[PDB]
Amino acid sequence: YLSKIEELQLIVNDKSQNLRRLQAQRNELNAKVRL
Amino acid sequence: VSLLSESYNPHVRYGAAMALGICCAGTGNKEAINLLEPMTNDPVNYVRQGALIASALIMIQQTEITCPKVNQFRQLYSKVINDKHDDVMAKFGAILAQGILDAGGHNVTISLQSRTGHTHMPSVVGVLVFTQFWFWFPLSHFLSLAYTPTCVIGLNKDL
Amino acid sequence: DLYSRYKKLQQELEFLEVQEEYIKDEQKNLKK
Amino acid sequence: AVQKVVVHPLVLLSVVDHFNRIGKVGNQKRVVGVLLGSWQKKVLDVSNSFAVPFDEDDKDDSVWFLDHDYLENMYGMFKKVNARERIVGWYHTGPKLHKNDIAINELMKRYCPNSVLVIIDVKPKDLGLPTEAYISVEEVHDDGTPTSKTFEHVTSEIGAEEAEEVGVEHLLRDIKDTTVGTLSQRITNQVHGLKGLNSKLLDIRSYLEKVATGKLPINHQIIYQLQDVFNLLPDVSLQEFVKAFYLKTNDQMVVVYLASLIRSVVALHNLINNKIANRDAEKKEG
Amino acid sequence: GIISLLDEDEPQLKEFALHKLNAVVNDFWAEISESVDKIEVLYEDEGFRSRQFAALVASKVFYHLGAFEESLNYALGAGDLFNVNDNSEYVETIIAKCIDHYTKQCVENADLPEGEKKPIDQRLEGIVNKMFQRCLDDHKYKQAIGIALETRRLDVFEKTILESNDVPGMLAYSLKLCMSLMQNKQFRNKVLRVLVKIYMNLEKPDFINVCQCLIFLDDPQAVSDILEKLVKEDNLLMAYQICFDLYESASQQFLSSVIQNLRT
Amino acid sequence: MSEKKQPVDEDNWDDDNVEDDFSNQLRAELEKHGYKMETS
Amino acid sequence: KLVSKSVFPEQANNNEWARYLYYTGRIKAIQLEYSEARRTMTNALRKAPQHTAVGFKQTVHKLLIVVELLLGEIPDRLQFRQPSLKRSLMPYFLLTQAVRTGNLAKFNQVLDQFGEKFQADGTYTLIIRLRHNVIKTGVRMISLSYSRISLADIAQKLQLDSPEDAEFIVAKAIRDGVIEASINHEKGYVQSKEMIDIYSTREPQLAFHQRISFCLDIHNMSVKAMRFP
């Protein structure tokens, strides 16, 4: 029960998948604008 | 490396396909095939054989029950060698993709990281020096030590 | 499973730190 | 009366491969050569030149070698390719001078209305300017001596004439045209602040070393004369620019009114269609 | 106005105010929060013998005020009744942060060569060697090896490989799995050399441990010694792992060194 | 709580109240309140 | 909250933050505050969500502008007035009627008339400073009007009957800082000034630092608003 705390609290921090989802989308966007 | 497929340039389109190859060799990935299928849909010829050779590197060690795109490419590479007016820089390594496609006849495989826990470094030497064989044709010949048997041998006495 | 429950999400944290840094650089190239 | 010339780095790259000659022919350290070109105006262009096999004794420094096999018939070649591109002057490296330079100028002032000596730079690390011109001058003194001939600091520049960047700007392979307001201004801040105020440290080398060991040009004729220009605004405590502060209300007047109203317009720019395309992308995703 | 009823400088009226503290502190979390300096006066006074309690409700109102490093400082000053509790909101969180400070302290001092450490203050280690005993007596030593991971230190690690009844194989996959989360070569070879010996300390000799430390700790002298065991114990049929993983997974330079050292 | 029939349904204010307090009054009325002086 | 001010979430519910800031508006209101209190009355008032709940803004807004009743500068809420609230603001319409009228018998006559509804208000800090608000409204109006008025002019018009308490009104008006009115000090008889030609040019673009630094705050609220999809 000791360190059963923080890893789901790091799964809280998977908004970087969402913010960097927008950044990955944007990479595709302007990358293919360039292409 | 799917994000690395976004590259503007054919050395990182092509080398990104190489990253699919030497990174995911013995894996049973279908998404790598899903990446390589537009990589042979590309007016650069040698990135299309980036898909030939790299997809031959995903089609090592594995059969049709592993992924359904095996026989598709087994017939598809002879299919694109039926097109005479392709580049023979495109079908440069097509027969090579058949040889990597049937290295052993799926009897042997790669050992980048052996099952023992430790890597198998002369296989790593063979794959890393293997790469840019346009620049030196015997770089193609250097893929000797990169293969280990996928077989079963019950030895108690050596004869 | 607190042996490696704790460790493994950091391995999948560093890399998106690097591309999180890096998308600004590529967009900075696409300005060029 | 020369402000500037146009410098093609082509024959400067011939100073580069003659800088490759001197590293392998022997004892000759400095790259000395002869500058071709044509006086069109106070502004000039240099399109070609040539680098002379030259030797210079360290004892009695005025020993020149400008061979006329190397001069005349090569001027027949350089005349034969183009009647336009004839001589205009000559060059050598090092920053300051050469005890022979003046004489080397007078060997070719018979060839040119103004043979210019442009002292050149093979290894640029400078705080000021690149290669710079020195015109024929007779300033002498208020004395009435025989005529001085040492060729004084007559400003020049590196001008760029024509297209020529099919090579050059293909060979950039690194650089970006900054839309100024994108750090290029602080690059200029480092170069004029730093590279100006270390030149100010050269000016305390002047106005300390000349106080220390400096003879007759300690206060020849320009030190107090440009202590006037130093006496634009050097004053003591805070210099008390009392006109300049409500004059500065007339200044910052403009910048803050434009930033205020105009950046509220920028608030429309960013804010409004940021929200529209935002929530289209947001709830139209469902 | 319950702290202005403390102008008497004897601790015996602080006992009666403390009497109020065990009752209505939650209604008075405003009221206690201005009292903090006098609580500091209660902690600085050594004649105030209830200074343990001053650090208790100090870390209560700092726990409420969101001070946590100072809830750590007066969590340390709280005394011995600190660790023994089983509260699910306050004490397990502040020992989660206290032992978070202990494990980042053991990472910091694990990176600090030859002592010069921040010392174990006098109220540490309590639920370490208490809840650790709950996990030993759970007979699930994954926690007990968990602390040994958390300290990067082979003191509780040596006791949890000389530990009680369970399969030795708990260590064995951990032999790979410490290889999984391994960061440095610094205690990789240390754990890697002490598990192969705790298997030799164990009665049953392991064969996968030297199959691993030949290809991760690469000692051509211990395999000469247990190769003299293989001449001695004479069973070549159990000898396959080290002989032909030695032929299989060893480096060619290490093959040269191992044929140098092994024929002796 | 909107649970009824209904879901179909100082500047100059404090001075609109005093200015609506003297509504027929003589707040101004110059020629009236100013020249009642010399009429008699 | 004066010591544990940690009252700041993402303010997700967007009505919780509104009526919450209203509630601490009542808190700072009842402690002692005019400006911050009335501007979070203003901020919670402009964050009042819709007209989708009747009465719950109406009674809470009967309680919202009470500090503005204590400013002296308050308009009469008739467009806020629900006609169902009209029968309940019958003291309250007449209360702000008693506010803007300078009468004293009316001032104690409305309190006398509806002290029970003022108990339903339960906020009798209104009446301890509301007579004070009468004299501050009078001195604000007349001090705003005339540059050099006499204290006898304002005094025996507003029934002050003596010069020295008028000097105390001028004294605590300087202390409260409304006007820079001095006294031609013999026996009273204020010599004073208005304040124009004060300044008008740099001082606005001083404020434009906060206007447009506030604007760039809202700019990055739009960039972080762009971070959502």
Curated annotation (Swiss-Prot), chain B:
Taxonomic superkingdom: Eukaryota
Swiss-Prot/TrEMBL PC repeat ranges: 15-49, 50-90, 93-125
Post-translational modification N6-acetyllysine, affected residues: 84
Subunit and interaction comment: Component of the 19S proteasome regulatory particle complex. The 26S proteasome consists of a 20S core particle (CP) and two 19S regulatory subunits (RP). The regulatory particle is made of a lid composed of 9 subunits, a base containing 6 ATPases and few additional components including PSMD1. Interacts with ADRM1. Interacts with ZFAND1.
Role, per record: Component of the 26S proteasome, a multiprotein complex involved in the ATP-dependent degradation of ubiquitinated proteins. This complex plays a key role in the maintenance of protein homeostasis by removing misfolded or damaged proteins, which could impair cellular functions, and by removing proteins whose functions are no longer required. Therefore, the proteasome participates in numerous cellular processes, including cell cycle progression, apoptosis, or DNA damage repair.
Family: Belongs to the proteasome subunit S1 family.
Stated name of the protein: 26S proteasome non-ATPase regulatory subunit 1
Organism: Homo sapiens
Residues of the full protein shown: 637 to 795 of 953
Swiss-Prot record, chain C:
Family: Belongs to the AAA ATPase family.
Covered range of the whole protein: 39 to 70 of 418
Organism: Homo sapiens (Human)
Subunit structure: Component of the 19S proteasome regulatory particle complex. The 26S proteasome consists of a 20S core particle (CP) and two 19S regulatory subunits (RP). The regulatory particle is made of a lid composed of 9 subunits, a base containing 6 ATPases including PSMC4 and few additional components. Interacts with NR1I3. Interacts with PAAF1. Interacts with TRIM5. Interacts with ZFAND1.
Function description: Component of the 26S proteasome, a multiprotein complex involved in the ATP-dependent degradation of ubiquitinated proteins. This complex plays a key role in the maintenance of protein homeostasis by removing misfolded or damaged proteins, which could impair cellular functions, and by removing proteins whose functions are no longer required. Therefore, the proteasome participates in numerous cellular processes, including cell cycle progression, apoptosis, or DNA damage repair.
Subcellular localization: Cytoplasm; Nucleus
Name used for this protein in its record: 26S proteasome regulatory subunit 6B
UniProtKB/Swiss-Prot annotation, chain F:
Gene Ontology cellular component terms for the protein in this record: cytosol; integrator complex; nucleoplasm; proteasome complex; proteasome regulatory particle, lid subcomplex; protein-containing complex
Primary localization: nucleus
CDD domains: DSS1_Sem1 (cd13768)
Expression across tissues: Expressed in limb bud, craniofacial primordia and skin.
Coiled-coil zones: none
Family: Belongs to the DSS1/SEM1 family.
UniProt protein name: 26S proteasome complex subunit SEM1
Species this chain originates from: Homo sapiens
Lineage, broadest ranks: Eukaryota, Metazoa, Chordata, Craniata, Vertebrata
Curated annotation (Swiss-Prot), chain G:
Residues annotated with Phosphoserine modification: 150, 162
Domain PCI: 18-197
Highest taxon in the source lineage: Eukaryota
Similarity comment text for this entry: Belongs to the proteasome subunit S3 family.
Function: Component of the 26S proteasome, a multiprotein complex involved in the ATP-dependent degradation of ubiquitinated proteins. This complex plays a key role in the maintenance of protein homeostasis by removing misfolded or damaged proteins, which could impair cellular functions, and by removing proteins whose functions are no longer required. Therefore, the proteasome participates in numerous cellular processes, including cell cycle progression, apoptosis, or DNA damage repair.
Complex formation: Component of the 19S proteasome regulatory particle complex. The 26S proteasome consists of a 20S core particle (CP) and two 19S regulatory subunits (RP). The regulatory particle is made of a lid composed of 9 subunits including PSMD3, a base containing 6 ATPases and few additional components. Interacts with UBQLN1 (via ubiquitin-like domain). Interacts with ERCC6.
Name the record gives this protein: 26S proteasome non-ATPase regulatory subunit 3
